[PDB]
A paper describes a structure:
The AcrA-AcrB-TolC complex is a secondary active antiport system in Escherichia coli, powered by the electrochemical proton gradient across the inner membrane of this Gram-negative bacterium. Its biological function is to capture cytotoxic compounds from either the periplasmic space or the inner membrane, and to expel them across the outer membrane, into the extracellular medium. AcrB is the inner-membrane component of the system, and is responsible for both substrate recognition and energy transduction. The asymmetric trimer structures indicate that this domain also cycles between three distinct conformations, and point to several ionizable residues in its core (D407, D408, K940 and R971) that might function as a proton-relay network.
To further assess the proposed proton-relay mechanism and its influence on the conformation of the TM domain, we solved the atomic structures of four AcrB variants, namely K940A, R971A, D407N and D408N, all of which abolish the drug-efflux activity of AcrB. Electron-density maps for these variants could be resolved at resolutions ranging from 2.0 to 2.3 Å, which are sufficient to discern the precise configuration of side-chains and structural waters inside the TM domain. The relative orientation of these two repeats is also unchanged in the K940A and D408N mutants, as is the side-chain configuration of the proton-relay network, aside from the mutations. That is, these two substitutions appear to perturb the conformational cycle of the transporter by altering the energetic balance between the L, T and O states, rather than by precluding the protomers from adopting native-like conformations in each of these states. Indeed, electrostatic calculations analogous to those carried out for the wildtype protein show that in the K940A structure, D408 is constitutively neutralized throughout the cycle. Similarly for the D408N variant, D407 is predicted to become protonated only in the O state, while the substituted N408 is evidently neutral throughout the cycle (K940 and R971 are protonated in all states in both mutants). These results imply that the ionic interactions across the R1-R2 interface that stabilize the L and T states are weakened in the mutants. By contrast, the O state is probably less affected (K940A) or not at all (D408N), since the repeats become disengaged in this state.
Author numbering:
A (entry chain B): 1 to 1033
B (entry chain D): 11 to 166
C (entry chain A): 98 to 241
D (entry chain A): 290 to 337
E (entry chain C): 50 to 97
F (entry chain C): 866 to 913
């Protein structure tokens, strides 16, 4: 193939041009996102039951739905929460690789068929079935700055005049409103009702009758009487459109003929559908849109399209309305693309400089400069064809591959130059001879790199999905790299390189290059002298090697592992958790403190605080909230003190003082699934008839035991909520029957007033919206208020609620959990420092084995994806190991010579570990992929040394030592050239601070540590490996 | 409310005896009450923590404290079948006939849940067999409505 | 034929008929399944101490085993050889007539007195200012 | 009585069924026992 | 049934359409709402 | 129809480029290829 194209440079160019066009096209059309999809497909079922307590939700909705989730394919597990905000979410998680659309339609269809078993008011609200996603493209805040709009006003404005246009925008896949459209709010007064012998029942009845769409028919409809001249639709009653009209609704006509209207027993207003969340943006009322990127969409284009749509809405905003961007991943993603493009370009520039420093002619210099971009472009085309996107992982994949790509370019060109100087052969003939020397090794190297990286595509679950991104990217690059090396670069060498006179090693040149050459020629002799001395004394080097292997193991076992580095993404989170039972106003006070802190103490760092009162992550309620902090641009936050990690630490220390509340700040995880931490995710399960209280006792028992092993387990805690005081009211059936008061009147009077009730729909400026009745606040606050509500008995007498009821305080759950259809309690924890999650999980199972009869357990989430796809790693690198050996055996036509290459593995790993350990980094994904590329490149260096050595012995009858010294003499320059270019190129990454530097450090540090020790050690140890392996056989 | 009072409400609820011990040594308010009027003694009664019930009483807890709906620790212990706690409370002067706001007594509650031993103890301590709640019901009315024959026989 | 799509297409048409079906039929749950007609296996359950009747074992199986088996991927249909327990009210026409009652009253009373009520909260949102109490109101719950 | 979903693998499904039953056994009431009266699976595995 | 064109558009057509976002490969969408109360929404997809 | 018309120039341009490259590769020349491609207007004008 090299021979073919050396005679056919135009054909070689044509292949190169085709590759470049394909890659160029791919670059134009490739999707862009921060991260690809990684988490297994999940489907969420969400339902709302206005005024319902957790047990009601669970026992009239959740259990019923769960019991119908049968006959659905590829389900891994299912879980649910039912809580006292009247909410249920059921999450079903599917095997990786499941078609999410199919998963979701199978779920929706089993649900549709369970709907008739659900309560009416739940069928009324609807039950949503959705694909799950935890990642937003951006969050658009919408605020009013002139004090003229409430959050409800704003949410409705957004809903009516912005949301649909954003949803229709190019590239957006989904939009969530942070609030609701208006609802017609009827706030009832029990004193007024009783005054006119009315109840909420009469209010609901009247609304249903006087706010309705009534079908009529047609004038002259078919069949007609013949001769009919007119056909026209009849329009009869249609829905009410205004608060005025709801106010005028007729409830009663008194004996004196005077009229009781709805506005006589209630305050009427456009309001929100719910009042659990109070949102503020720097203290001002706020709403917003949470936007997600559509499948295959380009993040940067979409964010741009979103901003353009918003801009064209701006002219029509009411006064004080303002758009705000508290969260947008696009600027961060832009940085990553610029940084990766910068890295690749200056890598090419570094290769240019190194080539000129050593080869000292611009023609040799130009060949890598052409070959490398051809390889990169082609890789993009292959990725595109594979369905990959440009993302953080795939971009760093190509960075991690730079050394490997550059090496193929340098090796082909450097060898032609050597052969010319060493033999005087003209460029064409030299190039043929040179490719004859490295051809098979180049292919062998491609096979070995394949055997290293491909198996990594076969890890399961989420970490597998991540590994696959690096694996396929790097293997594709290597494939292109060897194709360009066998096709284009030989053609370029044979046609672009000037001849070199035999024996001309440039030592006669003047100035610097003249001084460099004699210097490097002497250094080579020094080098080969040492190798000669080393090879006279190989025993001690076997000892040194074992010391390295031992030290590698020592450092490896102590390096803490992680997933992905935190980043300063310009935002972070503050959790606000008040004691159980704390009211919304108390939580607001604390958020007010939190906000006042950030806008004072972090004045120079913080752009905005988006305070969400009433929202939590592991349970909503009045006593919880979050403060989402957005920072100024990285450029205005110079220094480590003004980066997220430091701001966060200061915040948390500052808030540790706050009185009766847990308040702390934290950076955002790179993904969010994957659970980071050490982290295990454990489910305690009621397997028998046990009930919530016995399950809780068993949970407490488990937690107390776990706490007795600080050596192994840390922060073993429930993920859910503790029981709280609740108000139990008993209706006395007998007294109600004796008074002629129907239970239905009693129960809707109670529920409507104290819980709210969705009556029907109305039309507000052309948009359909809900109508809610509920008591005005001051009549549903306290137990004494219960007695102010009256119900009409059959005989017309008004009967106070206190006549037929009794009440007591008790405890109950504000949030009931289930797992695979059984009562459950989720427990989070982590392995203690130094301990493996596997060890921690084993203990948890041991402790779990001693719990009361009927109590079982399971592993879910990140832990579910350890109990399987972690018992899988060793067999993959066993396969890698075997396949690498088999390729080398075929390359060298020897069962033993392969060992002399494989022995290089620890030489680079030691440097990677030393560097990571020293800098205080962790064994994470970038570290690990870097190990593989460092191993790969050192293996490629070794392969060519052994190859040269072995052929000198086979074809020139040279002795073992003689061949080894000559081999190692010829390979020194290309080995140093590649390592120099690469190490310089990956250096900016190591020192980088600011946006994306967490990832950049993880990539750079390990690669640079490893390449330094791999290079410095292997040029001495590989001669040793080859000699000792050859002697032994 | 106080700092240590809150901690005591929580420890009594959780049945952390040793923490209660320490808290008692430091003067944590045995008369602290949460927003519904439950004292540490209410909590320990409700959740069946006998040793904490006894410790709390040694440390001056109001044995007849009532919550915002008039219920006492004896109501709770009797309702949830904690026999030993019922006995201890009574030994320490619990009002065997306390009426909550509904006119409900410890005897009513124990009858309703069919706690027979507890009913006998309450009777032994002078529980008024003829006490009527707001609906005119007695412990005996409750037993026949529940169809509890053993209980009905005990109440004559 | 893709059995997934066949099932989706059948159900899309079924939901058009669903509202036209008797309420008692809808409440029994109509099901759409894609499975072989023959049994893969039969899992039997017995009690070797003889401490459980046929009825007991059947309820145990329905209530603790069948749902998880039914959700297992590849399980197309599961038939219970027995029946889950229900609350059985066995009416006596003689006593009904004696008290001038019918099964209609019995049905109404059961719906009224075996109910699970949504009753809201004390101190619920939106609240008055200075509210200090927040607690769920618990009314009637299902009988057990 | 369990029927195989259209196109699903009979041996894999039987394995998943046994795995699931295994999760339940430890919590059986006393005397409860699973028996295996009828299985078309064994013959497939054995004949192969 | 019985609804006029505008009523059915406000209570049905617009409600469905604003939920027809982020569907793969959608080229365009057209609908009509009429005096018999009937709605038809047609979504046309890219050729492949 | 609009789509058809809009993409046609792209179609012709990439087709001509591909044809040219195939020739260059087949005949190891840039000149032979340029010589034959000049023929294209001779045929296109007749079609028009
Ligand atoms: C691009 C990276 C460049 C890094 C260069 C930095 C210095 C690296 C030094 C590498 C070690 C070479 O060290 C080499 O050791 C051997 C012994 O093992 C010495 O060899 C000498 O001692 C041995 C043992 O007593 C004798 O058998 C041998 O005959 C004698 O010449 C070499 O004279 C020395 O050169
Ligand atoms: C959790 N989240 C991002 C926010 C942030 C700021 C907000 O101002 C809000 C939310 C959640 C949303 C959910 C919506 C929901 N829906 C989309 C209409 C909803 O079902 C409820 C509900 N309690 O049932 C809301 O609280 C809700 O009305 C609401 O008020 C929200 C809201 O105000």
């Amino acid at each position: 193939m090299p021979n073919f194209f050396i005679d056919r440079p135009i054909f070689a160019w044509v292949i190169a041009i085709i590759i470049m066009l394909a890659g160029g096209l791919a670059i134009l059309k490739l999707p862009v996102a921060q991260y690809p999809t990684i988490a297994p497909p999940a489907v969420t079922i969400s339902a709302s039951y206005p005024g319902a307590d957790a047990k009601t939700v669970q026992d009239t909705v959740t259990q019923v739905i769960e019991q119908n989730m049968n006959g659905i394919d590829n389900l891994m597990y299912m879980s649910s929460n039912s809580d006292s905000t009247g909410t249920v979410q059921i999450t079903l998680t599917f095997e990786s690789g499941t078609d999410a659309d199919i998963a979701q339609v199978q779920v929706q269809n089993k649900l549709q068929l369970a709907m008739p078993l659900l309560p009416q008011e739940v069928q009324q609200q609807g039950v949503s079935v959705e694909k799950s996603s935890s990642s937003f493209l951006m969050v658009v805040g919408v605020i009013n700055t002139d004090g003229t709009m409430t959050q409800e006003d704003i949410s409705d404005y957004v809903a009516a005049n912005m949301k649909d246009a954003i949803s229709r925008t190019s590239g957006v896949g989904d939009v969530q409103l942070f609030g609701s459209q208006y609802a017609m709010r009827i706030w009832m007064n029990p004193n007024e009702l009783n005054k006119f012998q009315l109840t909420p029942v009469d209010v609901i009845t009247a609304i249903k009758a006087q706010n309705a769409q009534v079908a009529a028919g047609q004038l002259g409809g078919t069949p007609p009487v013949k001769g009919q001249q007119l056909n026209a639709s009849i329009i009869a009653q249609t829905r009410l459109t205004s608060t005025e009209e709801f106010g005028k609704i007729l409830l009663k006509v008194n004996q004196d003929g005077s009229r009781v209207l709805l506005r006589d027993v209630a305050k009427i207003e456009l309001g929100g559908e719910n009042y659990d969340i109070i949102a503020e943006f720097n203290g001002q009322p706020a709403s917003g849109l949470g936007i997600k990127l559509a499948t295959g969409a380009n993040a940067l284009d979409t964010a741009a399209a979103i901003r353009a749509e918003l801009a064209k809405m701006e002219p029509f905003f009411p006064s004080g309305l303002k758009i705000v961007y508290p969260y947008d991943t696009t600027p961060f993603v832009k940085i990553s693309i610029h940084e990766v493009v910068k890295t690749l370009v200056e890598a090419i520039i570094l290769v240019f400089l190194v080539m000129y420093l050593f080869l000292q002619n611009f023609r040799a210099t130009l060949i890598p400069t052409i070959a490398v971009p051809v390889v990169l472009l082609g890789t993009f085309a292959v990725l595109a064809a594979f369905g990959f996107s440009i993302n953080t992982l795939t971009m760093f994949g190509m960075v991690l591959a730079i050394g490997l790509l550059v090496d193929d370019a340098i090796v082909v060109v450097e060898n032609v130059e050597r052969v010319m100087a060493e033999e005087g052969l003209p460029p064409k003939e030299a190039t043929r001879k040179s490719m004859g020397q490295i051809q098979g090794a180049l292919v062998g190297i491609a096979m070995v790199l394949s055997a290293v990286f491909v198996p990594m595509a076969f890890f399961g679950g989420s970490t597998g999905a991540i590994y696959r991104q690096f694996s396929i990217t790097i293997v594709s690059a290597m494939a292109l790299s060897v194709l360009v090396a066998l096709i284009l670069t030989p053609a370029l060498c044979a046609t672009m390189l000037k001849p070199i006179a035999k024996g001309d090693h440039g030592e006669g040149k003047k100035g610097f290059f003249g001084w460099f050459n004699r210097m490097f020629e002497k250094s080579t002799h020094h080098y080969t002298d040492s190798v000669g001395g080393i090879l006279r004394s190989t025993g001690r080097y076997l000892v040194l090697y074992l010391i390295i292997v031992v030290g590698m193991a020592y450092l490896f076992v102590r390096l803490p592992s992680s997933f992905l580095p935190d980043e300063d993404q310009g935002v972070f989170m503050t959790m606000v958790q008040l004691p159980a039972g704390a009211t919304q106003e108390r939580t607001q006070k604390v958020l007010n403190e939190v906000t006042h802190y950030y806008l004072t103490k972090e004045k120079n760092n913080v752009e905005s605080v988006f305070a969400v009162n009433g929202f939590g992550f592991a349970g909503r309620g009045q006593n919880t909230g979050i403060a989402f902090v957005s920072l100024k641009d990285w450029a205005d936050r110079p220094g480590e003190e003004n980066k997220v990690e430091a701001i966060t630490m200061r915040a948390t220390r500052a808030f540790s003082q706050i009185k009766d509340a847990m308040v702390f700040a934290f950076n955002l995880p790179a993904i969010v699934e994957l659970g980071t931490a050490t982290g295990f995710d454990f489910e305690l399960i009621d397997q028998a008839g046990l009930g919530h209280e016995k399950l809780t006792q068993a949970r407490n028992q488990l937690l107390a035991e776990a706490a007795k092993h600080p050596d192994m387990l840390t922060s073993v805690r429930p993920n859910g909520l503790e029981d709280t005081p609740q108000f139990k009211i008993d209706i006395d059936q007998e007294k109600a029957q004796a008074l002629g008061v129907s239970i239905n009147d009693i129960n809707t009077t109670l529920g409507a007033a104290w819980g709210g009730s969705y009556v029907n729909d109305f039309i507000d400026r052309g948009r359909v919206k809900k109508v809610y009745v509920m008591s005005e606040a001051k009549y549903r606050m306290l137990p004494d208020d219960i007695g102010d509500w009256y119900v009409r008995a059959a005989d017309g007498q008004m009967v106070p609620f206190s006549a037929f009821s009794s009440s007591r305080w008790e405890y109950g759950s504000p949030r009931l959990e289930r797992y695979n259809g059984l009562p459950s309690m989720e427990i989070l924890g982590q392995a203690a420092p130094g301990k493996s999650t596997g060890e921690a999980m084993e203990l948890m199972e041991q402790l779990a084995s001693k719990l009361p009869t009927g109590v079982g357990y399971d592993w879910t989430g990140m832990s579910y994806q350890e109990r399987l796809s972690g018992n899988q790693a060793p067999s993959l690198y066993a396969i890698s190991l075997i396949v690498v050996f088999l390729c080398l055996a075929a390359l060298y036509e020897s069962w033993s010579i392969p060992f002399s290459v494989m022995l290089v593995v620890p030489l680079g790993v030691i440097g990677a570990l030393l560097a990571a350990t020293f800098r205080g980094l962790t064994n994470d994904v970038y570290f690990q992929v870097g190990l593989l590329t460092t191993i790969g490149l050192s293996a490629a260096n070794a392969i060519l040394i052994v190859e040269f050595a072995k052929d000198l012995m086979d074809k020139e009858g040279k002795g073992l030592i003689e061949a080894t010294l000559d081999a190692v003499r010829m390979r020194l320059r290309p080995i140093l050239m590649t390592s120099l270019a690469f190490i310089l190129g990956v250096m900016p990454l190591v020192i980088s601070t600011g946006a994306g530097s967490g990832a950049q450090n993880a990539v750079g540090t390990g690669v640079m540590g490893g390449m330094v020790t791999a290079t410095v050690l292997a040029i001495f140890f590989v001669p040793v490996f080859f000699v000792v392996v050859r002697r032994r056989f | 409310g106080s700092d240590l009072g809150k901690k005591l409400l929580e420890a009594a609820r959780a049945g952390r005896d040793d923490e209660v011990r320490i808290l008692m040594a430091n003067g944590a308010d045995v008369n602290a009450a949460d927003v519904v009027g439950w004292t540490p003694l209410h909590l320990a009664a409700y959740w069946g923590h006998l040793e904490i019930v006894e410790v709390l009483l040694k440390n001056g807890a109001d044995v007849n404290a009532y919550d915002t709906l008039g219920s006492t620790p004896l109501h709770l212990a009797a309702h949830f079948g904690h026999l030993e706690i019922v006995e201890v409370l009574l030994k320490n002067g619990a009002d065997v006939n306390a009426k909550d706001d509904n006119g409900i007594t410890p005897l009513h509650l124990a009858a309703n849940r069919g706690h027979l031993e507890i009913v006998e103890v309450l009777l032994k301590y002078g529980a008024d067999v003829n006490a009527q709640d707001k609906f005119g019901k007695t412990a005996f009315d409750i037993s026949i409505n529940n169809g509890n024959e053993d209980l009905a026989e005990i109440l004559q």
